Structures are given as structure tokens and as C-alpha cells.
């Protein structure tokens, strides 16, 4: 299987299809505050239907702490509550101080009644973002063709891939200390 992260760019998948490449999806809520992704509900539908695990990531546009709060607040009640964790995609810099807007994010997410929170911090932002002291489960970073040189417990390694069902897809691997049980709840022994 595949961990896949997938927005409206994914078009219609083929959920039969792809249900037996997928070990985990992460959908994309909203593009900051104002941006809903218009395919996430119906995914969600699917993949609950089909027993696919998924969690939940949104694109961040803050400009303030208190902004941070709001947006954060359009993720949660945007996203499905059956999420396993929900991810902070930081990429740009909406703000000087990206450290206190994404932890404010963050913070915002666990008050509301997230239990996991991720951190998907763009190429070469890990040590602009001061993703190092941010407060979160775990942190995501893409590096294509080659390993990222910081620490992350999800690698996204591809934005070419090709998966059944699906079609070009944005790839990711385990690269930390967290096993695939750790993300979905599941246990084999």
C-alpha cells in the first residue's frame, strides 16, 4: 500500500479500485480560511464506506496568532471528526513569526478536541519555521528522489507517483519513530 495525500486535484477516484493500494490518505480540508476543498466530503464518504483510514490536512494562510486561532477553528469543524490526526501544512510565510502562528494553529486544533496534530513543513522551511520547537505528534516534509535532511516521521517522496484507482499522486513513506499502527489505531499479532 500507499500513504497518499489527496485534495481536489485528485479528481474522482476510483475507491474499489483504490482501496487495495492505500494504507493511509491524508485530504486536504480548506486552503487557509477562505479556500473550502470542494472533493473532501465525498471522499470522506468513501473512504469511510470502504475502511480506508484517512486524516486530515489544511493549506495555512495565518497572518496572526489570533488568526491562526480562527483558521485552525475552520479546519476542525470543516474536517471529519473521525480523522485519526490532523495536519498543519506551513509553506509560505503569511507571517514573520511562522513559529507562534503555527503552534497557535496547533494549539487551537488540540483545544477544540484533536487528539494527534501533524506538522507538513515546506523544503527549506524546517529551520525557518522553527519546526524544531514546535509542540505537535509528529512532523511531515517532502524531499523528492532523496532523504530529508531533518528529522520527520513522514517522508513525502514523490509528486509523481502512480497508484490504481487514483492516478498521479502525491507519495509518502515512514521515516521516524512512529509505525503505521501508530497513525491508524490498527495492531497485527
Known amino acids: 500500500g500507499y500513504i497518499v495525500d489527496m485534495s481536489k486535484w485528485n479528481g474522482s477516484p476510483d475507491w474499489d479500485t483504490a482501496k487495495g493500494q492505500l494504507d493511509l490518505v491524508i485530504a486536504r480540508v480548506q486552503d487557509g ?3 473550502v476543498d470542494p472533493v473532501y466530503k465525498d471522499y470522506v464518504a468513501a473512504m469511510k464506506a470502504r475502511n480506508i483510514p484517512f486524516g486530515s490536512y489544511a493549506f495555512c494562510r495565518f497572518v496572526s496568532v489570533e488568526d491562526a ?3 485552525a477553528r475552520d479546519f476542525w469543524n470543516r474536517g471529519d471528526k473521525d480523522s485519526l490526526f490532523w495536519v498543519a501544512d506551513v509553506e509560505v510565510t503569511t507571517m514573520s513569526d511562522m513559529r507562534a502562528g503555527t503552534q497557535a494553529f496547533i494549539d487551537e486544533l488540540y483545544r477544540l478536541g484533536a487528539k494527534k496534530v ?3 513543513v515546506g523544503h527549506h ?3 525557518e519555521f522553527g519546526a524544531a520547537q514546535i509542540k ?5 516534509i517532502p524531499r523528492y528522489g532523496a532523504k530529508p ?3 520527520c516521521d513522514l517522508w513525502q517522496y514523490d509528486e509523481y507517483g502512480q497508484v490504481p484507482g487514483i492516478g498521479k499522486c502525491d507519495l509518502n513513506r515512514l521515516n521516524g519513530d512512529k509505525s503505521l499502527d501508530w497513525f491508524t489505531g490498527k495492531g497485527e499479532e
Open 69 to 71: 486561532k480562527v483558521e
Open 125 to 127: 522551511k524546517y529551520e
Open 118 to 120: 501533524g506538522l507538513y
Open 33 to 35: 480560511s477562505n479556500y
Open 149 to 151: 535532511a531533518y528529522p
Open 136 to 140: 505537535c505528534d509528529f512532523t511531515w
